Design a protein around this nucleic acid. Structure first.
Ligand SMILES: [Mg+2]
Ligand SMILES: [Mg+2]
Ligand SMILES: [Mg+2]
Ligand SMILES: [Mg+2]
Ligand SMILES: [Mg+2]
Ligand SMILES: [Mg+2]
Ligand SMILES: [Mg+2]
Ligand SMILES: [Mg+2]
Ligand SMILES: [Mg+2]
Ligand SMILES: [Mg+2]
Ligand SMILES: [Mg+2]
Ligand SMILES: [Mg+2]
Ligand SMILES: [Mg+2]
Ligand SMILES: [Mg+2]
Ligand SMILES: [Mg+2]
Ligand SMILES: [Mg+2]
Ligand SMILES: [Mg+2]
Ligand SMILES: [Mg+2]
Ligand SMILES: [Mg+2]
Ligand SMILES: [Mg+2]
Ligand SMILES: [Mg+2]
Ligand SMILES: [Mg+2]
Ligand SMILES: [Mg+2]
Ligand SMILES: [Mg+2]
Ligand SMILES: [Mg+2]
Ligand SMILES: [Mg+2]
Ligand SMILES: [Mg+2]
Ligand SMILES: [Mg+2]
Ligand SMILES: [Mg+2]
Ligand SMILES: [Mg+2]
Ligand SMILES: [Mg+2]
Ligand SMILES: [Mg+2]
Ligand SMILES: [Mg+2]
Ligand SMILES: [Mg+2]
Ligand SMILES: [Mg+2]
Ligand SMILES: [Mg+2]
Ligand SMILES: [Mg+2]
Ligand SMILES: [Mg+2]
Ligand SMILES: [Mg+2]
Ligand SMILES: [Mg+2]
Ligand SMILES: [Mg+2]
Ligand SMILES: [Mg+2]
Lengths: 63, 394, 131
RNA sequence: UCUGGGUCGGGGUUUCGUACGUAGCAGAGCAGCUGCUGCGAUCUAUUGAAAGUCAGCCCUCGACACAAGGGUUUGU
RNA sequence: UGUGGCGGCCAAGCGUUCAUAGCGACGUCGCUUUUUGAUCCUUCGAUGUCGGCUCUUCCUAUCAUUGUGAAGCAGAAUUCACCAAGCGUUGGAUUGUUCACCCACUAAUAGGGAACGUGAGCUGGGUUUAGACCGUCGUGAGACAGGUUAGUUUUACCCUACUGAUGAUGUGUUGUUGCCAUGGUAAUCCUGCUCAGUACGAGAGGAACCGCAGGUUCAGACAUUUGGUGUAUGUGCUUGGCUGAGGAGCCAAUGGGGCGAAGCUACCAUCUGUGGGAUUAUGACUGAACGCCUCUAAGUCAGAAUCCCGCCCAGGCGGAACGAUAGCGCCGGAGCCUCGGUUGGCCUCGGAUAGCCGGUCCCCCGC
RNA sequence: UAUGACUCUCUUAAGGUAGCCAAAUGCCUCGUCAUCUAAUUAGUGACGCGCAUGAAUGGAUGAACGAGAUUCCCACUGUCCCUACCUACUAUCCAGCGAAACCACAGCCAAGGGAACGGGCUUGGCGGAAUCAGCGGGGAAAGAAGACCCUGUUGAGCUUGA
């Protein structure tokens, strides 16, 4: 089965978890939990949020 | 005058004495009907509710929209350690009913089962069956025991066996075992007794009782909710906001000229702790307990034929408010009655099961082991470590 | 052959959804849902793919002041599919469709749910996106 | 059953989101000295850090003392 | 029981023919008290006087659904009738309404009773005090089942009933595992595919049984997922003030606002909801009465949302098996109190009744 | 076709003029038409044959104002679909302190009869100590010698042609 990646955070979404959001102009997103869901619907940038995958990739944390 | 608009009755009058249950362990009110054609087997078992999780599985039902599509289904895990047989009881059929005839216990009874006979094990001298256990080691007791078994062969029609749980293999606080009569169903009474005689002082696992994809019944006590109002107890209509003497009430409890209150009128009382029997729950998986071989342990219970992992049925951080499941477990489709750590009775079905839903073959593709203590997002700690990387605590 | 699985219905009687086609209608006031037997003090309510009776509140004057049949194609309430997926849309949307099943308009603005497209083929023909 | 629970600590899980201090030639600038020294919201690194986590979460076999007790009745 | 409602008998006619498929004039016989009357028996040291909401039960004069009979029943649709009250009988605009009328869904949107069910259950829209306005009437005070507006809805802690919760009798005391005597009882309906554009029909149209996938209403649960709650007052953010400042915090009757563990919870998520027996209506078999015929008289068969039992829920001044039984148990002369009733016993075939009983086995089969 | 300016006749001190209206005023009536709605005994605008509109018993209008009465729309929401969860004070239990209302005797029902709706009577069903928390079916529950209606050769306030 195909696992999804979260549209805000970037974590793997396992088949029983999360929600999907289909906008009026297409562009189906998927969300791990209501925290990332509210962060997407409040129009917030994942690159400025510390625990998202995109912030780690931008700031080169880890490795 | 008549009721202006018709409406169905709130609640059921078939579960009418909604009281606290007089028993904690679920009771088999009716065993399956015995026929001599089938071989000798057991009809019931006893497990403990651990928790619930997901299955992704492949569905084979021709004609549906979900034919050959993966689904996500809730399942309930019940931990079922093997039970110890410690006695046989016989029954005779009387015109007043089914009278018990003779009970014979085994020579050695564990302290788990001996705890059941006391309200205070700490103050007791643990004297139970001490003068009884000298009947298995003298000739005048052995001859009496053989005459007792022969009398049961001659006169009994219903044979039930006494089995108790093993509480030291469980993460529970309780050490006092649960005893239960299981009706032995099979051939004649003579070979039915000569089956239980050899299984005296022996362990019966869940595999001898239940098979894979069996539709069984779950008997148990509902989780208690205390003294509840009629709005929560019977799901009646809430009165409007302008109501003076409270709105979570039944407005009319009866007419005038029937000058009593009827027994069918929804009224406040105890909600929960009711003894229920829920039929037709499918066994998705009979898992295997933890076992050590060649030094290392085999704990890959939740691994499927498609997953190919090394994880157990236990989620991350363990099952919430239960503990760790290290024994055999039964995976039932959907929810079962009761709270966690509750003893439940698993019974074979009373009905013949001729249906594609009841005879469907289940293969598991994925068992979800994310943490139930919050929104868990990792199946295993090795996957979590491989995603997170090193932390400060290392 | 296959029959519709039930979903989390969230559009009762009195709901004003928007009309996602080129008939000239802007809203659709849902006055009832077809196939509803009912219950004492329980509003008829619909999900996606359910045929309702609707009424145009603003739009072209030749569509107003009358009852139309309609099919709900998008809902804002989250509903669970059998794949364990909870889906919801940005808005509640429907299209005007005759009693047989053919669409009154020509094109659809926005996606159409799979639960509606698998039941109504003439809406799935004019649908631009699915789910 | 040299064992049992309890308390504390630890580990696991999870919630929130990167602690105080230090350092920075990051900082709209401004001032006092003749480049330096100060004020400065905010930023970056230490730092997925800090903090909480059973009271009704899960394992500890790590420290601490306790647990071999008290009272009232019951006979074929 | 006049009136209202409901049902019969007769049959002139309607029904292209044809009284009675379905109706039925002129007459006539009844039933019911969900209509209004008539009466004044109870209540004036007070029985709270209309609706609506809520909730339970009952009735059948059955709208739908189960099983059926009859058509002027070809199919489809629809009428008449029987067993039948098990299960349903909705969401709204208008009006205080009962009633009514309309929109829409539906399977059907049937009719009613319970002090014209239900005010220490609610509400107070209407009616039905005192304040006011209009119309009509009256010289006037004032009157108006004529309109309009505003107008205090008290008390349960008593007894019973009901809902739950201790316990009581008595088995010597206690414990475990059980039985069920009795009460309760529950599941219901619809759509789509296939049958099948098939039977049937000139055509238009257009089924049904067995199967398959689901859904409505209800019931019992449950929290893996989604949602809700959130004072773990968990963690950030932030206004005013305060601790000299930083740091750490506090107060503002939960300061406010994000996110939020556990727990609780939603057809707002998920799971589950069943089998027999005698039979009703009816259709029949054999077969008289009545040389023939006949479902009936004797005998026999099929037979259902009904009934009863199962499954499920509770467990009797109701039993059982078994364990352990501390100054207590088991076995082998005296008397003292107290409760009483009785004054020989039958230790057994099955049963038939227009039929029995006992021998005999020289017969024939077996346990 | 109708309605009908016009005429005739009966008549009283005139015979309702200007306006206005199914109005806070219209029985019939949920009047008719239009609009508002998917659907309106509601609202608004017209029509006037007005049971019983009308000119300081004031008529019509009308800005501002109104804790005045009514209708519709936007926005908003647990009013509702359909309920759920949390907080505070209760209620609960305990220590101490501690009333009142009410009370023929009291308290399980079905039917009968009866002062025509019994807790007691009759016939049946049956009935088991002492209690706790709730509850509103019953006690034709309590309060108050019915304020409605009638009678009394009982009154009072008010009016007038008694
Ligand atoms: Mg009814
Ligand atoms: Mg009030
Ligand atoms: Mg959880
Ligand atoms: Mg209603
Ligand atoms: Mg009559
Ligand atoms: Mg004729
Ligand atoms: Mg008289
Ligand atoms: Mg009286
Ligand atoms: Mg009363
Ligand atoms: Mg009948
Ligand atoms: Mg009444
Ligand atoms: Mg009352
Ligand atoms: Mg009252
Ligand atoms: Mg009023
Ligand atoms: Mg008045
Ligand atoms: Mg009290
Ligand atoms: Mg019974
Ligand atoms: Mg043909
Ligand atoms: Mg949740
Ligand atoms: Mg939440
Ligand atoms: Mg939660
Ligand atoms: Mg600070
Ligand atoms: Mg203050
Ligand atoms: Mg929240
Ligand atoms: Mg017959
Ligand atoms: Mg038969
Ligand atoms: Mg039968
Ligand atoms: Mg005039
Ligand atoms: Mg209105
Ligand atoms: Mg008007
Ligand atoms: Mg005048
Ligand atoms: Mg006047
Ligand atoms: Mg006290
Ligand atoms: Mg009395
Ligand atoms: Mg007496
Ligand atoms: Mg009462
Ligand atoms: Mg009274
Ligand atoms: Mg008096
Ligand atoms: Mg006189
Ligand atoms: Mg006088
Ligand atoms: Mg005076
Ligand atoms: Mg005079």
């Amino acid at each position: 089965m195909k696992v999804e990646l979260c549209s805000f955070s970037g974590y793997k979404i396992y088949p029983g978890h999360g929600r999907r959001y289909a906008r009026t102009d297409g562009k189906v997103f998927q969300f791990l939990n209501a925290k990332c869901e509210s962060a997407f619907l409040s129009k917030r940038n994942p690159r400025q949020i510390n625990w998202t995958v995109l912030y780690r990739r931008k700031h080169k944390k880890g490795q | 005058s008549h009721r202006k608009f018709s409406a169905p009755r709130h609640g059921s009058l078939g579960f009418l004495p909604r009281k606290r249950s007089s028993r904690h362990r679920g009771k088999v009110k009716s065993f399956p009907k015995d026929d001599p054609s089938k071989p000798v087997h057991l009809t019931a078992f006893l497990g403990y509710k651990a928790g619930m999780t997901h299955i992704v599985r492949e569905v084979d039902r021709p004609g549906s929209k979900v034919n050959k599509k993966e689904v996500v289904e809730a399942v309930t895990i019940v931990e079922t350690p093997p039970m110890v047989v410690v006695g046989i009881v016989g029954y005779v059929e009387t015109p007043r009913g089914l009278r018990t005839f003779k009970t014979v216990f085994a020579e050695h009874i564990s302290d788990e089962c001996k705890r059941r006979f006391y309200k205070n094990w700490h103050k007791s001298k643990k004297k139970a069956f001490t003068k009884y256990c000298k009947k298995w080691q003298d000739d005048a007791g052995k001859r009496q025991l053989d005459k007792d078994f022969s009398s049961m062969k001659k006169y009994c029609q219903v044979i039930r066996v006494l089995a108790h749980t093993q509480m030291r293999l469980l993460p529970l606080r309780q050490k006092k075992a649960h005893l239960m009569e299981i009706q032995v169903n099979g051939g004649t009474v003579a070979e039915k007794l000569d089956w239980a005689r050899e299984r005296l002082e022996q362990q019966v696992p869940v595999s001898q009782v239940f098979g894979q994809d069996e539709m069984i019944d779950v008997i148990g006590v509902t989780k208690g909710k205390g003294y509840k109002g009629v709005t929560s107890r019977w799901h009646t209509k809430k009165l409007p906001r302008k109501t003076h003497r409270g709105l979570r009430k039944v407005a009319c409890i009866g007419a005038w000229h029937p000058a009593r209150v009827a027994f069918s009128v929804a009224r406040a009382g105890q909600k929960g702790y009711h003894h229920r029997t829920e039929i037709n729950k499918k066994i998705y998986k009979i898992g295997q307990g933890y076992l050590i071989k060649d030094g290392k342990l085999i704990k890959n219970n939740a691994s499927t034929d498609y997953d190919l992992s090394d994880k157990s049925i236990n989620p991350l951080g363990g099952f919430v408010h239960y503990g760790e499941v290290t024994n055999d477990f039964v995976m039932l489709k959907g929810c079962v009655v009761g709270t966690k750590k509750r003893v439940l009775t698993l019974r074979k079905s009373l009905l013949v099961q001729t249906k594609r839903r009841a005879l469907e073959k289940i293969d598991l593709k994925f068992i979800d082991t994310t943490s139930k203590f919050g929104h868990g997002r990792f199946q295993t700690v090795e996957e979590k470590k491989a995603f997170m990387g090193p932390l400060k605590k290392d | 052959s296959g029959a519709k699985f039930r979903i989390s219905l969230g559009l009762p009687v009195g709901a004003v959804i928007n009309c996602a086609d080129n008939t000239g209608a802007k809203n659709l006031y849902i006055i009832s849902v077809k196939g509803i037997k009912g219950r004492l003090n329980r509003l008829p309510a619909a999900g996606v793919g359910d045929m309702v009776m609707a009424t145009v509140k603003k739009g072209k004057p030749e569509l107003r002041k009358k009852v139309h049949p309609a099919v709900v194609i998008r809902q804002r309430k989250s509903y669970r599919r059998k794949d364990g997926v909870f889906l919801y849309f940005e808005d509640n949307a429907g299209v005007i469709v005759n009693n047989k099943g053919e669409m009154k308009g020509s094109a659809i603005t926005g996606p159409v749910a799979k639960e509606c497209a698998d039941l109504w083929p003439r809406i799935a023909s004019n649908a631009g996106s699915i789910a």
